[PDB]
Amino acid sequence: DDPLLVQLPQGVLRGRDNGSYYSYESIPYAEPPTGDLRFEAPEPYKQKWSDIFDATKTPVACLQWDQFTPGANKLVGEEDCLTVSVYKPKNSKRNSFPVVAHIHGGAFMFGAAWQNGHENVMREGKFILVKISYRLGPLGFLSTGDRDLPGNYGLKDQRLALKWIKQNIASFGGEPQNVLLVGHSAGGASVHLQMLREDFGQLAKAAFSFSGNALDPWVIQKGARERAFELGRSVGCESAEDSASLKKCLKSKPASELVTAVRKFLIFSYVPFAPFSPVLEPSDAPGAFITQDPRDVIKSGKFGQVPWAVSYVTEDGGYNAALLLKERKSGVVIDDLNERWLELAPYLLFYRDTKTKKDMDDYSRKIKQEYIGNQRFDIGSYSELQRLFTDILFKNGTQESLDLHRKYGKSPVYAYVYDNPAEKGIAQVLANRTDYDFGTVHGDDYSLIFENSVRDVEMRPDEQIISRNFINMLADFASSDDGSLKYGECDFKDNVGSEKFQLLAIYTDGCQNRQHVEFP
């Protein structure tokens, strides 16, 4: 048990030999955020160990209302979930590795470390992986907009895990000076949010945000305060008229009741998909995670100046436009948008809390005209609506992130767009069908790095190559002295100092840097 045992400040833990890698799982990095610690900042884990800690159990998911659990009851996970899991390749020739820290996606509402497979990256064997668990949904992100319930608990959980990695990953054979922080979807937005902290360079050497960034409209949201009291009203806390008594009452309810009440916010299947999300915190809440619009943070230059890459895929908006092609008895769900567009588009595209009712309806009319024209909403116009979702949910925020970083930051900033449709992906799950070519949907690229149950077990020959390319891209990025970035045969071109955007196009059998006034 020489390799299975690891010395931490609290004592020793025992991991598992998996043949090609060692795993040390469910290591707590904070006190359980239960009872009086619900809706509070994470507390550093303080318990000392008298025995050998059993680090052999799969990290539990955070208690969540999981979109992709079928059935009326989508509650899964545990409230006691603040854990890191370390995966180290087995190699008789090599025991020091760079580190990829991983933040799972799931719209800040659901998802889990264990659903992001580590077999692909362990088989390639070029870095240690650390999966971070963090509070989700109302438990991670409920907010009244004041210092009694400021919010962003899940982002503070991630940051404390990042400190844990700095302090302890060398006990596992990791190089703490070579940490690359990566994440997809809400994980990618979280990575960008962590990077926006001024001291982020002390926690990581580099960062990579896949199909998620701090400027996407489902990330930093307005309207949380009323959502918080709306949650209070659904769980028997209608009598609370201020933040402090709302917090007290909410803490008197079982966590499962609070999370189940997420269902009351979902007014069309799983729509809006992020009723709880990051927010701006007030200047008088100590330890606040973010208090300024991230655009103003970037312009100030006062953020972690590390190399960063941000990416999207060409039909990214398949999450979650594809739920509109789900068939019913009466017809197809998208048919309803011919009558309900003004009601639903602000929820689907995340501008219901940032515009007046008049401006909201004008924008709904405007974007429908530009993308759909005079077509009716049906399967024939679905591709144009999916393009609208791709642009507002994912692409526009990528372009604006890249624009602000290339102008106001000195560190290299890179980007790619991926176009290579998977056989199946998240869109077949949302639409419950396989008779429509959705294109390259949210997660088609990232699933090649961390395998999951949504795509095929077997990768096509081209995908096996692309997968190794991505994994090696991340490995080299974590070890890079100069902040350069390379996919396969293509160096990424830095966007700093170029008039046009520099966007690496990755496709089935190659890649090529392209230059754009605006993203295509």
Numbering used by the authors: 4 to 523
Which statements did the authors publish about this structure?
By far the best characterized ODE for the model insect Drosophila melanogaster is esterase 6 (EST6). EST6 is a member of the carboxyl/cholinesterase (CCE) family of proteins, which is represented by 30–110 different gene/enzyme systems encoding diverse functions in the insect genomes so far sequenced. As such, our biochemical data support the proposition that EST6 is a general, rather than specific, odorant degrading enzyme (ODE), but with a substrate range tuned to various volatile esters with relatively short chain acyl groups that are commonly emitted by the food sources for the flies. We also present a crystal structure for the enzyme which, together with in silico docking studies, supports the kinetic data and shows that its active site can readily accommodate short chain fatty acid esters, including the yeast and fruit volatiles above, but not long chain fatty acid esters like cVA.
After six rounds of directed evolution, the EST6 variant with greatest soluble expression (EST6-1) contained 16 mutations; K15V, V145L, R208K, G229E, N237S, T247A, D290G, I292F, I335V, E383G, S400G, A416V, F450S, F456S, N485D, I511T (note that amino acids are numbered from the first residue of the mature EST6 protein as it would be processed in its native form within the fly and omits the start methionine included to permit heterologous expression in E. coli). Four of these mutations have been found in EST6 from several Drosophila species (V145A, R208K, T247A and I292F). Importantly, the catalytic activity of EST6-1 was very similar to that of EST6-WT, suggesting that the 16 mutations principally affected folding, rather than function, consistent with their being located remote from the active site. We then performed surface lysine methylation, which has been shown to increase the propensity of proteins to crystallize, which yielded crystals in conditions of 0.2 M ammonium acetate, 0.1 M Tris pH 8.5 and 25% w/v PEG 3,350 that diffracted to 2.1 Å resolution. The structure of EST6-1 contains 520 amino acids, 353 water molecules, 32 surface carboxylated lysines and one monomer per asymmetric unit. EST6-1 adopts an α/β-hydrolase fold, including the conserved catalytic triad and oxyanion hole. The active site itself is formed from the catalytic triad (Ser188, His445 and Asp319), oxyanion hole (Gly108, Gly109 and Ala189) and additional residues (Tyr322 Tyr449, Phe450, Asn455, Phe456 and Val457) from a helix after β7 and a loop following β5. The result is a narrower and shorter active site entrance in EST6-1 in comparison to the open and accessible active site in LcαE7 and the deep gorges leading to the catalytic triads in AChE and JHE. The active site volume of EST6-1 is estimated to be 935 Å3, which is consistent with the observed preference of EST6 for smaller substrates than LcαE7.
